[PDB]
Amino acid sequence: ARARKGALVQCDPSIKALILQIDAKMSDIVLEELDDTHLLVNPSKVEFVKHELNRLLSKNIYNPM
Amino acid sequence: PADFVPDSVSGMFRSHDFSYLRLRPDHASRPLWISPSDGRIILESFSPLAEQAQDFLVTIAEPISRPSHIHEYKITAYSLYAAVSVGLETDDIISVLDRLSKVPVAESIINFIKGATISYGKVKLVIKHNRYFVETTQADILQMLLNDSVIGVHSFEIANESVEVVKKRCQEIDYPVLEEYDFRNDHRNPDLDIDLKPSTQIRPYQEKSLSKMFGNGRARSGIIVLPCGAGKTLVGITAACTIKKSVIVLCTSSVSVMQWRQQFLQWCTLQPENCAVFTSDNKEMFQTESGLVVSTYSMVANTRNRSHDSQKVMDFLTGREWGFIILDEVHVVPAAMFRRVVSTIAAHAKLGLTATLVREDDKIGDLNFLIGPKLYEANWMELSQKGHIANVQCAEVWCPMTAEFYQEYLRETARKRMLLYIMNPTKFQACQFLIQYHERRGDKIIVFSDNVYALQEYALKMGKPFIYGSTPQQERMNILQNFQYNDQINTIFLSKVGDTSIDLPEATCLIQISSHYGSRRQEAQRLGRILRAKRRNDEGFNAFFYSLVSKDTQEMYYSTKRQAFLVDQGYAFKVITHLHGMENIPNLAYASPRERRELLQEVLLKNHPLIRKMY
Numbered sequence: 001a002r003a004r005k006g007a008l009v010q011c012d013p014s015i016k017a018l019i020l021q022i023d024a025k026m027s028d029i030v031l032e033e034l035d036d037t038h039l040l041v042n043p044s045k046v047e048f049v050k051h052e053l054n055r056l057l058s059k060n061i062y063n064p065m
Numbered sequence: 066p067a068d069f070v071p072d073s074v075s076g077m078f079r080s081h082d083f084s085y086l087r088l089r090p091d092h093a094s095r096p097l098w099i100s101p102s103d104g105r106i107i108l109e110s111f112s113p114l115a116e117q118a119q120d121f122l123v124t125i126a127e128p129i130s131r132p133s134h135i136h137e138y139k140i141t142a143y144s145l146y147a148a149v150s151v152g153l154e155t156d157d158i159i160s161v162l163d164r165l166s167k168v169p170v171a172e173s174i175i176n177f178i179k180g181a182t183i184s185y186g187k188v189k190l191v192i193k194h195n196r197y198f199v200e201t202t203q204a205d206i207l208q209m210l211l212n213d214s215v216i217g218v219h220s221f222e223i224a225n226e227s228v229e230v231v232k233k234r235c236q237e238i239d240y241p242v243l244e245e246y247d248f249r250n251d252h253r254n255p256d257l258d259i260d261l262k263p264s265t266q267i268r269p270y271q272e273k274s275l276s277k278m279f280g281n282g283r284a285r286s287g288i289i290v291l292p293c294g295a296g297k298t299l300v301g302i303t304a305a306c307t308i309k310k311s312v313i314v315l316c317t318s319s320v321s322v323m324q325w326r327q328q329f330l331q332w333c334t335l336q337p338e339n340c341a342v343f344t345s346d347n348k349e350m351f352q353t354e355s356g357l358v359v360s361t362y363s364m365v366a367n368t369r370n371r372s373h374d375s376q377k378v379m380d381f382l383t384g385r386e387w388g389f390i391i392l393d394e395v396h397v398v399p400a401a402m403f404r405r406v407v408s409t410i411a412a413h414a415k416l417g418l419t420a421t422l423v424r425e426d427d428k429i430g431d432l433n434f435l436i437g438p439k440l441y442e443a444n445w446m447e448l449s450q451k452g453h454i455a456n457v458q459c460a461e462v463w464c465p466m467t468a469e470f471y472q473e474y475l476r477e478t479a480r481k482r483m484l485l486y487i488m489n490p491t492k493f494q495a496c497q498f499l500i501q502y503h504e505r506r507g508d509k510i511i512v513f514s515d516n517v518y519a520l521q522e523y524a525l526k527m528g529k530p531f532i533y534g535s536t537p538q539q540e541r542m543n544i545l546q547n548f549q550y551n552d553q554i555n556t557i558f559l560s561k562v563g564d565t566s567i568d569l570p571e572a573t574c575l576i577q578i579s580s581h582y583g584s585r586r587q588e589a590q591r592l593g594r595i596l597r598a599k600r601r602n603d604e605g606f607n608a609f610f611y612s613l614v615s616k617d618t619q620e621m622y623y624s625t626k627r628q629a630f631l632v633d634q635g636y637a638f639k640v641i642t643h644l645h646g647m648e649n650i651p652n653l654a655y656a657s658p659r660e661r662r663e664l665l666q667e668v669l670l671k672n673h674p675l676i677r678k679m680y
């Protein structure tokens with residue numbers, strides 16, 4: 001009997017690895033690893049990891065000017 | 066733009082609103098919209114007078130994008146410099162532009178056409194006994210050319226090596242030069258009597274391309290652009306057979322050079338005795354008065370070290386004054402060293418044949434003063450719907466990188482990351498499934514890969530022949546012939562060598578697992594291998610061009626960038642997230658984690674005469 005507030009992040013392997021890399025650079029991101037498709041993340045960092053990940057993925061996309 | 070109220074939505078168009086002008090009463094008929102600032106031309110291909118303009122627009126404006134319905138051209142200095150050559154003056158261009166435009170032609174556009182259309186036709190570069198004379202038909206030009214800072218009925222000599230300077234200099238000064246050849250009145254050069262045998266069937270677009278060259282009666286030097294497999298070889302053969310002079314052919318491969326001789330022999334009555342192939346294998350030259358030389362740039366553009374056997378041949382090429390040069394794959398002539406051949410070899414007529422006229426650097430425009438303007442261009446979809454080239458359903462498969470491989474992709478550097486996302490097991494499975502599926506359909510498949518390590522790994526894993534740069538000319542030729550006629554060998558594994566100028570009429574399907582970054586041309590050249598499939602007219606036939614790319618990797622950045630030219634032509638790529646029925650295939654490569662782990666580490670680790678008896 002113990003509740004812990006947070007954000008449940010559901011995603012795929014590729015997004016999971018990126019979140020781990022972001023968590024390694026900034027420790028507080030990931031609170032706990034739940035499964036290969038779920039992560040518990042800090043509520044304050046939800047709006048930041050979601051915004052940061054898109055910036056990282058922007059490199060893989062070719063935006064013509 | 067006087068007393069014209071802006072609209073509330075005019076803000077969304079930043080100085081691009083062209084409503085300040087009014088529409089003509091005959092808008093419903095006229096097919097053209099003209100941008101008064103950018104020079105763009107929007108063409109209605111579904112209205113009357115569409116065909117009358119699709120050729121006129123190609124002459125004065127280079128095509129940006131030509132999709133199904135609405136074409137988009139653009140007028141630039143070089144495009145006008147191309148149109149100014151073939152008997153066209155400012156008045157004709159302006160008259161037709163106004164006659165075809167729904168809106169009146171703005172003054173800015175009229176100014177642009179006026180500036181560049183008056184330069185043509187006052188300087189002529191002639192050649193005599195390997196000596197180049199800049200002959201001009203009026204005396205006044207002497208006070209211009211001889212007083213030019215760069216330079217150095219009146220005709221004066223100029224250094225052979227210095228042609229590439231004056232020709233570019235002529236562009237900056239008012240008068241650019243034109244290379245016209247009156248082969249009818251040229252008697253000093255011995256002639257070669259070769260003609261197209263009756264079995265030949267000159268297709269319409271081939272005749273149109275030649276007409277743009279021989280329209281006035283004197284051969285014009287320039288470039289002809291036709292889709293891959295359209296028959297550029299016969300276009301060059303016809304030009305050689307109509308000029309009827311000693312001709313030399315330069316082609317960027319040994320297999321391709323062999324292809325040219327066989328094609329030249331088959332389509333026209335060129336006797337084998339007068340043909341000499343100057344490749345790395347055989348270097349004998351024809352001793353008959355007038356003959357033909359089919360060689361390659363690497364064997365003609367070399368400067369420092371030439372062998373004794375290859376030195377006599379080069380002198381034989383340089384000594385004689387040739388009458389025609391055919392530069393196959395002319396997108397490589399403006400390179401640092403290949404352009405030297407255009408100056409060393411003496412010729413009165415120069416032709417360029419290439420399906421793609423694009424290069425990453427800015428050297429593409431250099432072709433203007435090397436060989437001349439662009440005479441003719443042809444659409445890809447137009448020839449596709451007429452049965453001249455095959456139809457292809459382009460596809461782009463998204464093979465999501467497996468979790469194990471992907472993790473390493475984050476840490477590794479740029480140069481090794483490439484080998485990492487080329488060898489993900491999912492790509493092996495997708496390639497294996499597609500190969501089996503299409504082989505059952507009785508298709509001949511080609512698998513391209515610029516990376517050689519992956520090429521060998523794929524080939525040895527699937528037990529199929531492969532070709533790459535280290536291959537002796539004969540072995541790759543034997544592989545090519547076997548792939549063509551041997552029913553057991555349905556698929557091969559080519560590399561960057563087979564990217565261009567290799568003809569396989571039997572190939573119908575095409576796959577690529579690696580790529581040379583963002584080059585848009587390599588994609589089109591590779592697609593050309595299947596655009597000439599033999600059974601391209603049986604009902605419902607569609608060739609295939611697959612592009613396996615790893616998701617969430619830099620490959621997608623290059624993939625969406627390396628197909629920007631095919632989209633302009635009209636081809637559309639279809640995204641394939643999942644191959645139906647892929648799981649039920651009996652055995653798939655790297656289906657168990659053990660093999661995936663083994664492969665991961667395997668690719669990761671990649672980075673006294675009597676004393677003679679004594680020994």
Ligand SMILES: Nc1ncnc2c1ncn2[C@@H]1O[C@H](COP(=O)(O)OP(=O)(O)O)[C@@H](O)[C@H]1O
Binds near residue numbers: 266267294568570593
């Ligand atoms: N007029 C024609 N009649 C018959 N076959 C033709 C004709 N024009 C082209 N071909 C065929 O088209 C194929 C491609 O020709 P090729 O000159 O190699 O094209 P490209 O150089 O434009 O890629 C060859 O099989 C060739 O024989």
Ligand code: BEF
Binds near residue numbers: 566
């Ligand atoms: F354009 Be082809 F394949 F030489």
Ligand SMILES: [Mg+2]
Binds near residue numbers: 298566
């Ligand atoms: Mg060719």
